Amino acid sequence: LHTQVGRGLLGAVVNPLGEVTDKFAVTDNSEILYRPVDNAPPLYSERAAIEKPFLTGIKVIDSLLTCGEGQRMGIFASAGCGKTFLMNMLIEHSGADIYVIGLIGERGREVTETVDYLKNSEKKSRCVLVYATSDYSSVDRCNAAYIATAIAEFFRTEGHKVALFIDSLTRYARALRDVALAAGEYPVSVFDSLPRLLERPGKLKAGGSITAFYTVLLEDPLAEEVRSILDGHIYLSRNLAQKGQFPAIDSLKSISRVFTQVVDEKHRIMAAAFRELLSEIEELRTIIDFGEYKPGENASQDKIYNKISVVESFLKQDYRLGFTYEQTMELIGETIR
């Protein structure tokens, strides 16, 4: 019902009981406070409008799927489309003050993977990790989500720009379902914990912000209405991963619902122009695989064909590399020209 919060948790690993069990970094700060894990979402009047971009350093995201400070973004993928590696990129190449990661229902190898990743990360001293493995109860998995959010909420009230990661909402949802049948399942369900959890992030007028990334596993009914609640979603295409396209983000099947609110007109024009070229390329891919593309016949098709490699090159991104907003807009500029 209460968890540890504060700068003293920076660099630490926290189990579903709110106790530190490991560290991936050590900091000079030792601030430890206590707050409840279940807190009310901000009043609408307390919430600031999402107007400022949350840069990720990932070209396809920053250019076509631009995130906003205080936004909730879904990450939809089937294991493995490189979901974990996308999250790692989001941590490395963004510029948040503090990163809070909640790993829900992960095998435990997996938990150690994230820890070993953080142990060599440059963001190590700005991260807090909360985990719940497959060996913990369904109640403990749910609390892992609340603890991570509550930890993030404290940093937000201090005015920090916080990025919250929940991997995954899928395993969290199962745990919630198992908990629901406990006590045999007015006016409180166990099923409604999911919206309460998701409306907690955001930018506060009086405080910092929480930009949250919720991962959803694909193999689902409420995968479709976690989508309904959030402010956008990123889809990792299995097709794109197998073609060696990394990150395997399907731009055309993804959206940031705050896109036009966080980029200027010049950006908006380039993005729209890029998406059309993308659509034209997909049309040609079909025509090619149908065996109806002969060079020389249609000048427009030939012009589109010769744009495929530069477009693919723009979408491609080494996971170790991060791009500034000026670089991304510069690159997409030569792609559509």
Side-chain angles (χ1 to χ4, degrees):
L1 187 146
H2 266 72
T3 187
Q4 273 178 121
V5 295
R7 291 184 190 69
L9 293 180
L10 289 179
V13 181
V14 182
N15 68 5
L17 294 179
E19 62 180 300
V20 179
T21 65
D22 204 23
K23 290 185 269 290
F24 49 85
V26 286
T27 62
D28 51 337
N29 201 316
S30 63
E31 167 190 62
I32 288 298
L33 302 172
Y34 297 96
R35 302 296 158 79
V37 302
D38 191 26
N39 198 39
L43 273 305
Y44 76 103
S45 52
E46 295 170 316
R47 286 168 168 275
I50 301 178
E51 56 181 317
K52 178 164 176 172
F54 183 98
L55 285 164
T56 67
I58 307 171
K59 290 177 291 172
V60 55
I61 296 181
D62 287 346
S63 59
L64 301 176
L65 309 168
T66 312
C67 297
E69 281 192 28
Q71 180 178 4
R72 302 133 28 211
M73 181 71 79
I75 302 182
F76 293 76
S78 57
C81 297
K83 174 208 69 273
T84 289
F85 260 52
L86 177 59
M87 304 188 305
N88 294 7
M89 285 188 67
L90 284 170
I91 299 178
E92 284 315 303
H93 309 295
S94 55
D97 293 325
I98 283 169
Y99 300 84
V100 181
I101 312 161
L103 301 187
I104 317 300
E106 299 267 326
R107 183 173 171 175
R109 329 160 300 180
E110 288 165 347
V111 171
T112 297
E113 294 197 16
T114 296
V115 169
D116 299 12
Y117 171 79
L118 295 165
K119 269 201 212 153
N120 297 94
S121 166
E122 66 183 309
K123 306 308 185 66
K124 60 191 307 180
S125 292
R126 309 158 81 90
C127 292
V128 180
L129 177 58
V130 184
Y131 75 98
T133 66
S134 320
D135 313 333
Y136 286 88
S137 71
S138 294
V139 178
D140 291 325
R141 299 174 180 220
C142 289
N143 292 262
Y146 311 146
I147 284 167
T149 305
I151 286 175
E153 279 184 319
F154 173 75
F155 289 120
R156 174 171 65 183
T157 64
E158 298 291 293
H160 300 150
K161 167 181 164 173
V162 190
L164 180 67
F165 295 85
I166 304 290
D167 185 19
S168 65
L169 260 192
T170 294
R171 303 290 183 90
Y172 165 78
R174 311 190 178 283
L176 210 54
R177 162 214 306 162
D178 293 336
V179 168
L181 314 202
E185 293 181 59
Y186 293 90
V188 66
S189 176
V190 183
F191 297 161
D192 325 303
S193 279
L194 191 152
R196 287 157 177 71
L197 178 70
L198 303 195
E199 233 175 36
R200 291 184 73 176
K203 169 58 181 175
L204 300 177
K205 294 178 179 179
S209 65
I210 299 180
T211 302
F213 297 93
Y214 304 93
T215 65
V216 178
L217 193 61
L218 270 44
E219 39 213 335
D220 191 324
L222 295 342
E224 313 213 15
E225 301 139 79
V226 53
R227 181 175 79 221
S228 309
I229 308 168
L230 302 179
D231 309 319
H233 54 259
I234 298 173
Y235 171 79
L236 294 181
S237 184
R238 185 177 137 290
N239 180 40
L240 284 173
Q242 295 187 284
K243 182 164 138 218
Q245 175 96 288
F246 177 82
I249 303 176
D250 193 340
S251 323
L252 302 181
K253 293 297 162 297
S254 319
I255 191 179
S256 172
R257 290 144 98 107
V258 302
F259 176 69
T260 64
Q261 315 167 15
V262 300
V263 304
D264 59 15
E265 189 185 13
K266 113 182 60 174
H267 185 141
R268 212 167 311 148
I269 291 168
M270 281 183 269
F274 187 86
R275 293 192 188 96
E276 161 151 40
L277 174 52
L278 213 47
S279 309
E280 274 162 358
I281 287 181
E282 284 312 307
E283 283 180 345
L284 186 59
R285 292 191 193 277
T286 299
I287 290 179
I288 291 169
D289 289 344
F290 281 180
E292 309 172 308
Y293 171 71
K294 306 176 35 215
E297 302 187 333
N298 195 307
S300 285
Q301 284 181 355
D302 292 341
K303 180 178 302 179
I304 292 166
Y305 181 85
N306 295 320
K307 278 293 187 67
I308 295 178
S309 174
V310 287
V311 160
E312 285 178 345
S313 179
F314 173 81
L315 298 174
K316 291 177 180 299
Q317 183 165 350
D318 194 333
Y319 74 99
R320 293 164 293 176
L321 291 182
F323 292 73
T324 71
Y325 176 80
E326 259 67 41
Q327 284 165 342
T328 291
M329 297 314 294
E330 178 185 18
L331 289 177
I332 196 172
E334 269 297 316
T335 298
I336 63 173
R337 289 173 176 83

